[PDB]
């Protein structure tokens, strides 16, 4: 897998940006995919240099490759709720060595549009597990100390814009969005 | 664009396939590339150039294409294929990639199972937690201030979900039901 980074939290109207990390390859680009939907193709840059679009994302695309910095990058402007999705990056190789189609994908980032404020979560013990409650955006991620027995269940999202989920063991929360660490 | 049927279905053991049409300028002139994608996960490359495996890719998968038609045919199929497929190609007329709408791919003989619930009381504030899991099929009922999660399917293909109760801590016994297939259990 590529390494994908960047903010996971856009205000509309504003610029979403993301870079993935590759050594190599012939073609690099982007897709996404909005929850609950399908892949929807961004753009691809060639090794020729040679650049292509979806052309519904008018003027509003920018991708870039820095081969000798080992990265790749896109640029969305003006965004509105509508590019609210995970984004991936992929990388062409195609017959390498011995490797044959080879194709890595970033592990994807999901990107929410939106003017409301990043809100870090409130951790509470469940008694086992714990309850992970009213933050926003997405994701948080959970671990123990223990991999066995671990259920995290999806996110509510409550009358009050805000998420929770709980995480059970039959705990170290993350929320990146906030810089969140308990 | 690219046309996929919404929905197939295979049994444990036998075979399924899954269509992709498109037109001259796309599948016609150009390889076609398949994709197995789990949710919560990027799509993996099954299929590259009409009929070729990526390494590590098992040869149960395997592809073909016919004029303007491609297909991905699936053997000795496993409770964990299920997932979304994908096929994508290079749009000579258009300049661009397209995709197909994706093949959400179940598994048959799935036996049905009764929820395993768990009610957490509150620990400022009140929140009552009830945790349902590990249930097929993937629908169930739980019984001011409750919020309830639509079913997911869970990593091994059943289902969950989660209700939340909140409530004043002078508001705060207190039940969750969960109905599944008729049956009803309590936690308090
Ligand atoms: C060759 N891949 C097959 C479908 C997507 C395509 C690809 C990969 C990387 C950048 N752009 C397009």
């Known amino acids: 897998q590529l390494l994908e980074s960047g903010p996971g939290l856009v205000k509309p109207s504003e610029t979403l940006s993301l870079t993935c990390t590759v050594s190599?390859?012939?073609?690099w680009g982007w897709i996404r995919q909005p929850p609950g939907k399908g892949l929807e193709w961004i753009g691809s840059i060639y090794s020729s240099g040679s650049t292509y679009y979806n052309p519904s994302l008018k003027s509003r695309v920018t991708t870039s490759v820095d081969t000798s910095k080992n990265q790749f990058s896109l640029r969305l402007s003006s965004v509105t709720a509508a590019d609210t999705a995970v984004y991936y990056c992929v990388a062409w190789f195609g017959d390498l060595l011995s490797l044959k189609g080879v194709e890595l994908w970033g592990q994807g980032t999901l990107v929410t549009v939106s003017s409301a404020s990043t809100k870090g979560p409130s951790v509470f013990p469940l008694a086992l597990g714990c309850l992970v409650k009213d933050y926003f955006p997405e994701p948080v991620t959970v671990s123990w100390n223990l991999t066995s027995g671990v259920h995290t269940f999806p996110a509510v999202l409550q009358s009050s814009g805000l998420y929770s989920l709980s995480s059970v063991v039959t705990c170290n929360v993350d929320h990146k969005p906030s810089n969140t660490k308990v | 664009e690219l046309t996929q049927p919404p929905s197939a279905s295979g049994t444990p053991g036998q075979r399924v396939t899954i269509s992709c049409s498109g037109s001259s300028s796309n599948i016609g002139s150009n390889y076609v590339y398949w994709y197995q994608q789990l949710p919560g996960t990027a799509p993996k490359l099954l299929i590259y150039?009409?009929?070729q495996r990526p390494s590590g890719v098992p040869d149960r998968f395997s592809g073909s294409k016919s004029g303007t038609s491609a297909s991905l045919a699936i053997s000795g199929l496993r409770s964990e294929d299920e997932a979304d497929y994908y096929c994508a190609a290079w749009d000579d007329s258009l300049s661009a990639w397209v995709f197909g709408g994706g093949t959400q791919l179940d598994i048959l003989g799935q036996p049905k199972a009764a929820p395993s619930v768990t009610l957490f009381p509150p620990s400022p504030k009140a929140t009552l937690v009830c945790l349902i899991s590990d249930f097929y099929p993937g629908a169930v009922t739980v019984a001011a201030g409750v919020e309830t999660t639509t079913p997911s399917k869970q990593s091994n293909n059943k289902y969950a979900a989660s209700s939340y109760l909140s409530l004043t801590p002078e508001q705060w016994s207190y039940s969750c039901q969960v109905t599944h297939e008729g049956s009803t259990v309590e936690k308090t």
């Open positions: 150039r009409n009929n």
């Open positions: 190599g390859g012939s073609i």
